[PDB]
Ligand binder design. Structure first.
Ligand SMILES: NC(=O)c1ccc[n+]([C@@H]2O[C@H](COP(=O)([O-])OP(=O)(O)OC[C@H]3O[C@@H](n4cnc5c(N)ncnc54)[C@H](O)[C@@H]3O)[C@@H](O)[C@H]2O)c1
Ligand SMILES: NC(=O)c1ccc[n+]([C@@H]2O[C@H](COP(=O)([O-])OP(=O)(O)OC[C@H]3O[C@@H](n4cnc5c(N)ncnc54)[C@H](O)[C@@H]3O)[C@@H](O)[C@H]2O)c1
Ligand SMILES: NC(=O)c1ccc[n+]([C@@H]2O[C@H](COP(=O)([O-])OP(=O)(O)OC[C@H]3O[C@@H](n4cnc5c(N)ncnc54)[C@H](O)[C@@H]3O)[C@@H](O)[C@H]2O)c1
Ligand SMILES: NC(=O)c1ccc[n+]([C@@H]2O[C@H](COP(=O)([O-])OP(=O)(O)OC[C@H]3O[C@@H](n4cnc5c(N)ncnc54)[C@H](O)[C@@H]3O)[C@@H](O)[C@H]2O)c1
Ligand SMILES: CNC(=O)CN(C(=O)Cc1ccc(-n2cccn2)cc1)C1CCN(c2ccccn2)CC1
Ligand SMILES: [Mg+2]
Lengths: 244, 258, 263, 260
């Protein structure tokens, strides 16, 4: 009798057992969801990580920069969940920005980072909306980019683009009766900038614990936020609401 | 086996069965919560309405402008739930702006604006001050908001009161955090509640019609259930790292220009 | 000058450290003809580069508000109208800001604070719009209240209300071809502000206010000088000029860019 | 006495006399600024347009996707303004998004090659321009870019809105770098400017979006007139907003502050 009982959910972005996607997958299974997982490049390595989850789940290859992987994705998911079944949820937990810092980054690096971290949220929704049920939910991972900060410079730019992409994805998803939202998380250990979060957060922030973030994603995947779309839910201990 | 199984929750703001608080109370009870209800002024009338809820719940009087009601509130709640028990949730679903403030903008006297701000914004801090000493860690305080980031033809001073409420919520979160309690607002789209000239109504109509147009998933102003479900999500253990914040239950209308 | 020939009303002078004193000085240096309002002040306004009539205005006094336009018309001469209005008025009792806990502020104190700091922006616009020329500009003073901070408490709440009031004032002002905007300044060492740094409110809160102030210069990409009100006064004069003609119901940040940076 | 008397300002983005950059250049010259102009691809065509400005100004070639143009830019500007002189202002009025990413094409049908080109020209180039020109800018200087409020999604604008969201973030980082030189960096978010071609259905949607602007704006909005936008850019180039950086100034009639 779980929050996601009977729901079929695709979870992308597992690379290690410290991945936010690993914790999202674990919490979703504990809550009764039937998962389909996607991985990039190191598929044998990813499969061994997915064996650590409480329940067995099929693992599909997905390089978001590969148009052939995107064109075949819905058919491959349909084979995994069975003909006649559709997804109730999609989790985008993918991000990358080449190490290149701000003025020295060539455009080839920035473009690759934006492709993977922002444009792919639209690519995944385009591929999967035709196999999603009404009342469905698409959730992506964000970090608040409204202010510039030292380090993560071009990744912050990619998150600003992702927030805008999410608002357009919501317009398309709405046609299918599907919601689209981002979870803006505080820093997770997957220094001064990081320590400031626990200081600002009225309820504190534990950088070593991804469970509050995973629970927030599951709340959006559930039927309990049915009138929220094109939006951002902050799972950051309330740090973004406080100056000092 | 409900979302709020075993939780003790105080719900303020029921006046009619169309009240957002009525729907919040109904959904919470369906989800296993044990409620304590508070009403203002028309207590006999409110008891007849709360008799329509799926389960029995004690009804306490609370006028948020009455300092004696606020000073005695925690003791009265403790008596209703039993000594040794504490609340897990608090719902503030209270708002009022006298007619003059809702040239309506320039003609509203300060006495009217001050009363509206007292009831709609300051009282969120008053309720938290009174109830935090009787709230359990992991607890949740939720208030009702209407997005006031942009001015709109009608609502005028009520919009100003909501801007003040959003700021109050951020300070309440600082205090609530000391008790391991979250404080958040639900910004709802327009709902056809009881209280909700020619121009005023025409402005509301256009505002209301644009909302459903702008919302990617649409907006039904006759249905308070999506709003009630969102409040219950915040009262649950499923948004444990969210505080001093605003969750929008508006069909996504605020995220779209046209 | 930037404001050559403009007739501008400036409220909020109490000392020569008042932001309004600096706004008035820069405006006169830029060729504006001023009318001043105060709630002792005549001895301070005598320190400005040019002579200007001083009118009494208690924003909580409805008789002062009802007679204001007539009194301004008498000061500037029949047939003349105002081009600009500056609201540089703010108040919150010590129970609502400083060392007092957020929950311990009584509503009577908060309400007086909101009346003076937010509602009066609408009162002033109501009284003066009938005597303002098209292309006119109303400017108010703000402190970014988007995030909660220590000590500022109910004054931050009053600023959140002021920002909302400004958006509604812009709707009304637009009917007269007048703009309405706020300048959100960084912290300025005015009369009360220097005392807190000195230790007037104690060690614990004095350190917290000092950290809040020091972080500003650290976050600001161009730095922030708390001792200098001139960049703020110049920003207000930019809004009073004809150089931001399509900006209304808005907020211009004169804070060194601190609000755009997290660390 | 002009607002920009004696200031040396670089203005990019002129293609036609309807370009926002044309109006920025005109107002800056009327206010006493000495300009250096940059143009892309159609240099002969751009020269005929810049001949319509009140004063003569050198025109330099600048393709923001060309790293050799960027590497030589500061040296070429120094030659145009004279050795020992530096710039007081820089105007970025450059934007591009292929028809696959903006217009009638569904949001999901824009290929990444087209989106990436659009982001390179419309957002990344703001950082490229600042990197090339900050070493030849005076303290108290000002870098200004053109923006269109992307905080809410809207029909047709699609990936150009995404590019503007990226530009706003780029501006905040450029301000951190510019601050080291005592230089400000800001964007001007303008309302729509007229700078059946796309069909009935989309043509009506774009028209409704445009008409709502004048309705929302408390002081109205004239889509035919770039002068209020050009004046706002000149205010940021002046010494009158000295404590504003990493920020956005809205020259949109106040439309973004009103719901209806
Ligand atoms: N860790 C934090 O502090 C934090 C905070 C807020 C948001 N986030 C976001 O959460 C998400 C997950 O990050 P994480 O912290 O779990 O790190 P992670 O390194 O564990 O996950 C990033 C994932 O992206 C995948 N990926 C990279 N290139 C890809 C491609 N071409 N195709 C498909 N997938 C690709 C990687 O394989 C990996 O699984 C990202 O969007 C990240 O920006 C992280
Ligand atoms: N209806 C909408 O369109 C809408 C939209 C967004 C948010 N909200 C908010 O939701 C909340 C509830 O509104 P509603 O639409 O259910 O209206 P409602 O009329 O049903 O409820 C308002 C409640 O406030 C109570 N109240 C007024 N003065 C009080 C006082 N002095 N002490 C205690 N209680 C007092 C009333 O008794 C009533 O129960 C309010 O905060 C309102 O601003 C409403
Ligand atoms: N750090 C700062 O000092 C700071 C930062 C940002 C914004 N501001 C704002 O700038 C404005 C001016 O503040 P200041 O720092 O110059 O301090 P100040 O004390 O010099 O000015 C406040 C003024 O408000 C006037 N006032 C108070 N009650 C009044 C009433 N009933 N009627 C009319 N006038 C009344 C006082 O006479 C005084 O002239 C305020 O809005 C303030 O919040 C100040
Ligand atoms: N027109 C509007 O409604 C509107 C509204 C808000 C903001 N803006 C922005 O104002 C700016 C100017 O646009 P406009 O409306 O004047 O249109 P425009 O077509 O007149 O100007 C765009 C300019 O970008 C230049 N450009 C394109 N590719 C380039 C490259 N590779 N290298 C260098 N320059 C290149 C073009 O040559 C042209 O001069 C853009 O950033 C645009 O997004 C326009
Ligand atoms: C004069 N106009 C209003 O204030 C409308 N309004 C109300 O009047 C609410 C209200 C209901 C009942 C009482 N009451 C008196 C005695 C016992 N109960 C008091 C107040 C509500 C206020 C809250 N709501 C909204 C509606 C839109 C935006 C924000 N808030 C719904 C209408
Ligand atoms: Mg209009």
């Amino acid at each position: 009798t779980g929050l996601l009982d009977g729901k079929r959910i695709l979870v992308s972005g597992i690379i290690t057992d410290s991945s936010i996607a690993f914790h999202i997958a674990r919490v979703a299974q504990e809550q009764g969801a039937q998962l389909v997982l996607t991985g990039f490049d190191r598929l044998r390595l990813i499969q061994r990580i997915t064996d650590r989850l409480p329940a067995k789940a099929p693992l599909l290859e997905l390089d978001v920069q590969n148009e052939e992987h995107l064109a075949s994705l819905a058919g491959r998911v349909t084979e995994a969940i069975g003909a006649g079944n559709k997804l109730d949820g999609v989790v985008h937990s993918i991000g990358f920005m080449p190490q290149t810092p701000f003025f020295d980054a060539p455009y080839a690096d920035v473009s690759k980072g934006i492709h993977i971290s922002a444009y792919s949220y639209a690519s995944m929704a385009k591929a999967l909306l035709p196999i999603m049920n009404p009342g469905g939910s698409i959730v992506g991972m964000d970090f608040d980019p409204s202010r510039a900060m030292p380090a993560y410079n071009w990744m912050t730019v990619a998150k600003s683009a992702l927030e805008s992409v999410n608002r357009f994805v919501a317009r398309e998803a709405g046609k299918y009766g599907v919601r689209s939202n981002l979870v803006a998380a505080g820093p997770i250990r997957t220094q001064l900038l990081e320590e400031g979060w626990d200081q600002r957060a009225p309820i504190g922030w534990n950088m070593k614990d991804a469970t509050p973030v995973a629970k927030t994603v599951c709340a959006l995947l559930s039927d309990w936020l049915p009138a929220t779309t094109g939006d951002i839910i902050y799972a950051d201990g309330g740090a973004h609401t406080q100056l000092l």
